[PDB]
Amino acid sequence: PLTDTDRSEDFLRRVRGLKAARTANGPRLYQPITLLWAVGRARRGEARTLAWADTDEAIGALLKRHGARGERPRPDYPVLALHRAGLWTLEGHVGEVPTAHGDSALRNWFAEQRPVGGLAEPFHDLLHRSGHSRVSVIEALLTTYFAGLDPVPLLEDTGLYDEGHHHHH
DNA sequence: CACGTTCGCC
DNA sequence: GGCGAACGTG
């Protein structure tokens, strides 16, 4: 039947289908940092959704510490991309949600709308109860986004080190 | 500071 | 093209 394994391969295919903006030597880290943050919060049974102010500040902090490809603290980018992929719910806003195309209008949209948000339930609940799904998604994110980067400090800020650190010695 | 334009890429 | 994005250019 439909298992957490299949739910996990579904999530992973959806995560792999994301298209992050790319730098000269790799992908920008907005989306994996946002995903990894939600991964940790799901792992701990934290509240799925958060007001925008807390989300802005939590993801902003992770972007400033661990934005190793020149990321500026602008969670509005990854949240809109994740929302566009169906991976991130936003509520409390009026009208449709913009794409992550542009700059100041996106920042302003969150300032005015202040949407209630978080990673979508099927994946939140899945990540809360399945260590398998968490490990699998962390390793897909670290492989794709953190080649040539030290992921450990961001694994510690998300509470995922023991699931993101594979042993190789 | 804020907007319109530009870059990289499926 | 469209979107995830940064950046002149006033």
Residue numbers in the entry: 2 to 170
What's written in the study?
The sulfur atom of phosphorothioated DNA (PT-DNA) is coordinated by a surface cavity in the conserved sulfur-binding domain (SBD) of type IV restriction enzymes. The sulfur modification-dependent REases SprMcrA and ScoMcrA use an SBD to recognize the DNA backbone phosphorothioate link of the RP stereoisomer, which is adopted by the naturally occurring PT modifications in five DNA core sequence contexts in prokaryotes. By contrast, the SBD of the PT-dependent restriction endonuclease (REase) SprMcrA from Streptomyces pristinaespiralis has a relatively relaxed sequence specificity, targeting GPSGCC, GPSAAC and GPSATC, but not GPSTTC or CPSCA.
Crystals for SBDSpr in complex with the RP form of the 10-bp hemi-PT DNA oligonucleotide 5′-GGCGPSAACGTG-3′ were grown and obtained at 14°C with the reservoir solution containing 0.1 M BIS-Tris pH 5.5, 0.15 M ammonium acetate, and 25% PEG 3350. The structure of the SBDSpr-GPSAAC complex was refined and rebuilt using Coot and Phenix.refine. It's worth noting that the ND1 atom of H102 also formed H-bond with N7 atom of G4 in GPSGCC and GPSAAC sequences, while this H-bond was not existing in SBDSpr-GPSATC complex. In conclusion, HGD motif formed five H-bonds in SBDSpr–GPSGCC complex while four H-bonds in SBDSpr–GPSATC and SBDSpr–GPSAAC complexes, which explained why SBDSpr showed a highest affinity for GPSGCC. The base recognition pattern by HGD motif in complexes of SBDSpr–GPSAAC and SBDSpr–GPSATC is different. What's more, close comparison of two structures revealed that the binding of the GPSAAC released the methyl group of T6′ on the complementary strand from the binding site, and converts the weak non-bonded interaction to unfavored thymine methyl-solvent accessibility. Difference in the weak non-bonded interaction between GPSATC and GPSAAC results in a lower KD values for GPSATC than GPSAAC bound by SBDSpr.
